[PDB]
Amino acid sequence: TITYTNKVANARLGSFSSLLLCWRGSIYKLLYGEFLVFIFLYYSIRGLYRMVLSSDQQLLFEKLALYCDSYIQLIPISFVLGFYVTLVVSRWWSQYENLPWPDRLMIQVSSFVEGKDEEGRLLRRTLIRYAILGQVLILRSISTSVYKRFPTLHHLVLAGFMTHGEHKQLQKLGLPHNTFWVPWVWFANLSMKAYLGGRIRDTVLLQSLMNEVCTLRTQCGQLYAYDWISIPLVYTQVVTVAVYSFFLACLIGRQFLNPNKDYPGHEMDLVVPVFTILQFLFYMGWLKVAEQLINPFGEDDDDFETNWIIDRNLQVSLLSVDGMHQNLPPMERDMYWNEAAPQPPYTAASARSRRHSFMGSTFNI
Amino acid sequence: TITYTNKVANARLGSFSSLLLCWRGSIYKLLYGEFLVFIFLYYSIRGLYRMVLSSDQQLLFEKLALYCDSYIQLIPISFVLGFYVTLVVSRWWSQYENLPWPDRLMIQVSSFVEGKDEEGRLLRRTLIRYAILGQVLILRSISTSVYKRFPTLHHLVLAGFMTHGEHKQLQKLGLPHNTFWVPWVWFANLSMKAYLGGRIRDTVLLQSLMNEVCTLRTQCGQLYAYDWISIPLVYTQVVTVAVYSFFLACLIGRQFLNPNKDYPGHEMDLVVPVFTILQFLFYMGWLKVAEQLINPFGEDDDDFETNWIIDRNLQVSLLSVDGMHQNLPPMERDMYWNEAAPQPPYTAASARSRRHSFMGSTFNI
Amino acid sequence: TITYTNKVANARLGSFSSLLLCWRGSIYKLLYGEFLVFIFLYYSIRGLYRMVLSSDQQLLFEKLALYCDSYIQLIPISFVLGFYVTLVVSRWWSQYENLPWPDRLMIQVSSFVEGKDEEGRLLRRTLIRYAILGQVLILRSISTSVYKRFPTLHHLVLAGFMTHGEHKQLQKLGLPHNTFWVPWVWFANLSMKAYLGGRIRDTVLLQSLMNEVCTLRTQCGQLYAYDWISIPLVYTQVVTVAVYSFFLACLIGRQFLNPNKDYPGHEMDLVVPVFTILQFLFYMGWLKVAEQLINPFGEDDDDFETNWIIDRNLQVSLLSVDGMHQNLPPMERDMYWNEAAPQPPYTAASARSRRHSFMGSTFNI
Amino acid sequence: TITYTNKVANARLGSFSSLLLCWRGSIYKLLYGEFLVFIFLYYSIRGLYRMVLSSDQQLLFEKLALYCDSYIQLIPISFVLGFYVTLVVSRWWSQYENLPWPDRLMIQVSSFVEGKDEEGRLLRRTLIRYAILGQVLILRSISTSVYKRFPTLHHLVLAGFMTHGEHKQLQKLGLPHNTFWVPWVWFANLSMKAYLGGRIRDTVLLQSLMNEVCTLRTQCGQLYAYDWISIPLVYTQVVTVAVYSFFLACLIGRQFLNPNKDYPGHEMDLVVPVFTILQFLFYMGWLKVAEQLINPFGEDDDDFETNWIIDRNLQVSLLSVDGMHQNLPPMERDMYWNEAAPQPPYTAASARSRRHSFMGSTFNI
Amino acid sequence: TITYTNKVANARLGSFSSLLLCWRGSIYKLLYGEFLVFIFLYYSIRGLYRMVLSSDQQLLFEKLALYCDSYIQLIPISFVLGFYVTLVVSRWWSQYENLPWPDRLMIQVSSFVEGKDEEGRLLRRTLIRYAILGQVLILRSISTSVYKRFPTLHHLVLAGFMTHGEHKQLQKLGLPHNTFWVPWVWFANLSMKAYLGGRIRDTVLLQSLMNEVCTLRTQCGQLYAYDWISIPLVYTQVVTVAVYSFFLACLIGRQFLNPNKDYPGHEMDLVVPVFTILQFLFYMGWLKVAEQLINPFGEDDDDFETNWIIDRNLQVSLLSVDGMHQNLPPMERDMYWNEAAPQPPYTAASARSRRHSFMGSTFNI
Ligand SMILES: [Ca+2]
Ligand SMILES: [Ca+2]
Ligand SMILES: [Ca+2]
Ligand SMILES: [Ca+2]
Ligand SMILES: [Ca+2]
Ligand SMILES: [Cl-]
Ligand SMILES: [Cl-]
Ligand SMILES: [Cl-]
Ligand SMILES: [Cl-]
Ligand SMILES: [Cl-]
Ligand SMILES: [Cl-]
Ligand SMILES: [Cl-]
Ligand SMILES: [Cl-]
Ligand SMILES: [Cl-]
Ligand SMILES: [Cl-]
């Protein structure tokens, strides 16, 4: 992901205009393959119309240039690009709001399960490993950068995510469908077995534990649904055909005709169509937004990095559930043990923000 | 459903332009029946105006051609198409977010109910079959591909979804309304009977079980409401009349008049109206999006496949509640039993994504 | 409500164009009273300008016709109609998502309350009748077709919804406000009295029962709020004045002036303004959408039928809590008692939809 | 609030056009102070250009009239007015969805707390008074019509909302911030004290009681956040400057120039600019919608009446909690004690709505 | 934050027009750095074209001026500015709806934990300090005004937020990732230890306590996600390039050409382009809205003040859990002890709002 939040913290003169000189993640990196083709096609007609076509077949070219010029209209293209990109962006954000984070589950696992030895440590570690295997098994059929890292189910055994005893059991289900739901049942069975062992001392705690897994199930199912069902191909093709039809009329129609005929529109012969190049840039960088965000789990620059998340979620969870169970800092009296209104200090660099408390809009009347 | 997510993973040169050469699910498969009619109507006037109408009735045709040309405007049509398709798409996605998945219920059924013999197996199997019959009875009055598969309630008995003992009981209710709510009451009564049998050992578990059925009830009711209440016919007709009025003025008005009169707009006699055909394609593929997504439960290409779901939900649930109840893989020490920070390996093919952890935006100041 | 979902299941040639020949619920049924006025007003000027006004006062009419022609612009009208109808439709759907359905409460009432005789039957029946009276008392101050059916609170007694013992108690509150909240308190008091009688055997069940009534309270309050607070009259009037100002300039300004003066725009004298009639139809059918959906609880064609719902909810609930309490079909072994993978059959008519299970996007790489 | 729902129940000929003759809440009541200024400014130039400026300085005025006429465009103004009003309306509705209604709390207070004498009546009354004081203390810093009614915290004592014993305790906190959170802690402490007194007989009931106060806390905090943080002044100023710049060019540029020069656009000398007045009305009634709804808690006509709500919520709650605790109507057999399908009667006035139950879309195939 | 809600309470004549004379937070404070550059660039050509370029190179300038005039169109720019600002504003509000307020947790901490001495006071104070440390550790990596106030983790010790015993424990985790999740585990462990000490007397209360921390975890994670993932740089750059391309063609093309050639558009030589300056103001104040709200946690004027919140949340919580635990005002009979309908008085200043209760829309029929 491209991060530029610190560069746009304040609205100053050189804030947004300085983002036009960045290479990675910018339109200059995506439009390179198409600008060359457009320029070559444009200059392959200026070199035919001027030195190949004769005077007889040079007046039928001008009637085409003046006819393919009333069909360049900016209303419908700007409607479709703008009613499509909004939907693409809304889907893109919802695809991230459904990413499973095992932070609300490790808090309860580190507390409700009681034990600080063997058979109380292994239980917690397996209970927290199942919820991570569940997310790894789903972020492998939708993402590409994770598939190239775990090409086979035997590669999960070598990385520590799985076990040889679990691989042989997951191989023996006899179902042709995907198998990203088995760990969610293993977790429930292990938790019930733990409850019937004196570890969990109440049924309320067990129900609370199951309620936080029933939500990760939904979050993992929604990602699969989003990947399986995509935006209709009809809607995808309409925008592309509209944009290409618009830009095919600028090749013939926006060319600089011979001024010897004194046409109402053509009066100069500057070589470079600057305002055609700018229009191409502006109207293609709008389509490349959808082209980039139509599949957030890829290998682009503005795509989710779903390969450091599965390491952070492993390390943090394994630390929280194992090495931080009965470990708290010493309990001591605070600095404000006897003080009605604490007054934290302000540094010299930050003394403008010493504001007063808001007391209602109608206070000053 | 048409899936093309893997073809648009990255934003490259040949990514969106390569989707215009696909047959299934494209505008070329939907516009075939109307393009022929439009072309025939267009060419039936070029063949009358040129060789049937006389010179007297050839100058009243040109006043019609130049008069039916100021009524071709692209603003209101592009407003209605764009304020209608967005609503259609928003309804289409919500119709899928309400599909009942029995994955959050089988997890609790496989755990809370205790027994690994007869009278403890049949209980779980019937409890999980009722929730499937409930979804089958509703995905039969809204969908067509399921109705043609189960034309009669006697066909459900032969497929294993129902039983001869329950058919005779559902036939004896004496109510003229639909009967998609009976299994949701049978489930509750069976669960209460199971609780008063020593199977479920607490009331918290039973309440948790009922809470997950009270949600499937809402999800099944919302689909019926969506099917019963549709977008107003006034709104549906306005867009159609606008589009047809727009395209009826292109038959007479966009024709190539005789250049012998030197009209301000007509100066060439190219046979094929390429930029009229392109406009027809672009402005009809936008309407066909709504035409296709106005009823997601049909027999189109970009329509929900609600016939493999009812098989997957049966097999997965029946496997989960029967053959995986007290079945867990062996519990063993992990690969990182003594390791503060696990370091999973990276393959050679995926070594660019070894990124560093984000530590806040203001870290670098 | 007008239902046409089965007519638009598939996207075929004659799918949307066949909806323009329907009478009920169409623009032809709403625009009849105003098309006549528009036509009469239009033809009352063609009959004055041509045979009443003299040659002196026939050249000040044409300067008005050519001046009231640059004020016909389609952009602001299409903006307001399109930013208003979307809000109207969004409110219309939310008014239906708040309709109380007593299906999540009857499930718990038929199970938690224990008894299969007198004093255990009357309790359940009264508990389920209070929740129905609560919805009847609110769908009587917002809807008209229900008010005309129950004009007085004494009419509810004669229909079985109320009782003579409760009518005299609801008459004796001494509050000037509406009384649609009393049954929600009667239900709670009756449930607590039942709990302190050995009927409900736990407090978890009673809390679960009260949680499902605390939601119906919100759903009933939201409908009253929606009816009490409406879209601002300023916003309602702006659209009407814009549309009427647009259509008042088409009466004088779109008329066919005398071609003897050779004006730049008028060159023909066809009697019927076809493209003015079509514009009127298109731009008034858009306003009638908001005109119809601004109050869903009315007596139109595309309005909610809130008179069969209050019968279905009564019959279904009374059957569920009375004649289906301890009544379940016999428990027998399934057809798939010993079968790892069930294979339901496919009929001959539906054999194209035998699709294969989706196994992830990146499976084929 | 202005209520006109009953006048627009059905879509008839005289439905929306009859709303243009209403005084209160209409554009005619809001645009009066500005139409006079606009008319005076317009007619102060027609009276200078015609009888003050000489022939020399009457030909530099016409170049200004013809030059300040290509800057009157309706695209950007209609975009901003329409992308701003939608946000204003969305905020306006959310400001009402967060109004605290103490209807879900009194139901539980009237049931869970057990006692029908002194020390069981006072407890319930104080518990229900704290939740009302909490809402009164917040609907006094955001609203003006409530601040003018309770200008001082001593005025709450005289109205019965507060007590002299609570005023002295709320005066002795020593915090400069607002004090709208104290009753929410008093309620919790009183409920815990009641539980440790034999009144509430279980912890589940107490937790359910606290869960309904933790939601009113959020609802009261959201109103304060909405009042404290408003729409950015930049966004507010942009629309005003755009509208005023648009309307300043219509003073000089839409004037009726002397027709003695035969200009391409000016050919008549009608005194009143009817289509300029209509445009002013239409384009300023759109801005006044935002001007009115930018602060719903005011003293306008289309503003929330937050002064009858705080009386209804007091009377209803005090009646439900105190005088309706153990008070239920007699329990008797229903009219349909032995009847499988009840058949409520239909009156003669409402006999058209006897519709048949919907049985699915695909029923007729 | 800029607060002007009290100035726009009512819709009067001088309500919105009076907001154009405010300095702080206005467009005049943001456009100062760019207006000077634009004016200098504009006047550097009027001073070259008029007194530097010769008559030969003064006719190639006018063909550029007349050619750089058909590319000034307001449709696409007003589409992109308006489809971008809406998304920016929607993100800006959601960034505030996720701010953690410890008001729903202190209510339960002040009640469920039982004790009014030492070892019962320290427990509550530490339990409430952990939830504040959790929010301080996250509002330090996203905000700048808080980072400049706490540049180092040792500065938190000196302000009372942290302790020397917990600093040494947070220094000893051995993880390279951010450490904003440790207090949420410390809180859970301390609460479980308190429960196994006789302080919390039930498991329902402990589960309710943990449920309110599992929500603050999500609220704190969402802010970090919003800061880490920003709007795509492609979409950010497209708007800037469109606006700058629009405003670069107004420098040459909107200049006042020599009227000696009698051009169709240029006929006057007024020095100041008033309607170009106004367009610049209007089209740059729209971009500066996004420029300001693209990062709400900054040091602008319309930016969240996240430095008084962390003091209010500390003081209020510490007062609630320590000095207000078993402290309630005396319980006395109300003013309306025997009164069916209370009648609070109305002041003379507010007597217009004595409205009558709404009794349904169809009441008057
Ligand atoms: Ca991508
Ligand atoms: Ca379909
Ligand atoms: Ca209606
Ligand atoms: Ca107001
Ligand atoms: Ca900022
Ligand atoms: Cl799911
Ligand atoms: Cl160019
Ligand atoms: Cl429902
Ligand atoms: Cl053509
Ligand atoms: Cl409510
Ligand atoms: Cl016409
Ligand atoms: Cl809050
Ligand atoms: Cl005028
Ligand atoms: Cl999270
Ligand atoms: Cl200018």
What key attributes describe this structure?
homopentamer; binds calcium ion; chloride channel activity (chains A, B, C, D, E); binds chloride ion; Bestrophin-1 (chains A, B, C, D, E); chloride channel (chains A, B, C, D, E); metal ion binding (chains A, B, C, D, E); transport (chains A, B, C, D, E); 2 domains; 365 residues
Summarize this structure briefly:
Chain A has 365 residues and is mostly helical.
Can you describe what's shown?
Chains A, B, C, D, E: Belongs to the anion channel-forming bestrophin (TC 1.A.46) family. Calcium-sensitive chloride channel subfamily. Chains A, B, C, D, E: Keywords: Calcium, Cell membrane, Chloride, Chloride channel, Ion channel, Ion transport, Membrane, Metal-binding, Phosphoprotein, Transmembrane, Transmembrane helix, Transport. Chains A, B, C, D, E: It is found in: Cell membrane; Basolateral cell membrane. 5 copies of one chain form a homopentamer. By secondary structure, chain A is an all-alpha fold. Chain A has 2 domains: about 25-95 and about 230-295, no CATH class; about 105-230 and about 315-320, no CATH class. Helix content of chain A is about 50%, strand content about 0%. Chains in contact: A-B, A-C, A-D, A-E, B-C, B-D, B-E, C-D, C-E, D-E. At the A-E interface, helix 4, helix 5, helix 6, helix 11 and helix 13 of A face helix 3, helix 4, helix 7, helix 9 and helix 10 of E. The structure holds calcium ion (CA) (5 copies) and chloride ion (10 copies). One chloride ion binds next to helix 13 of chain D.
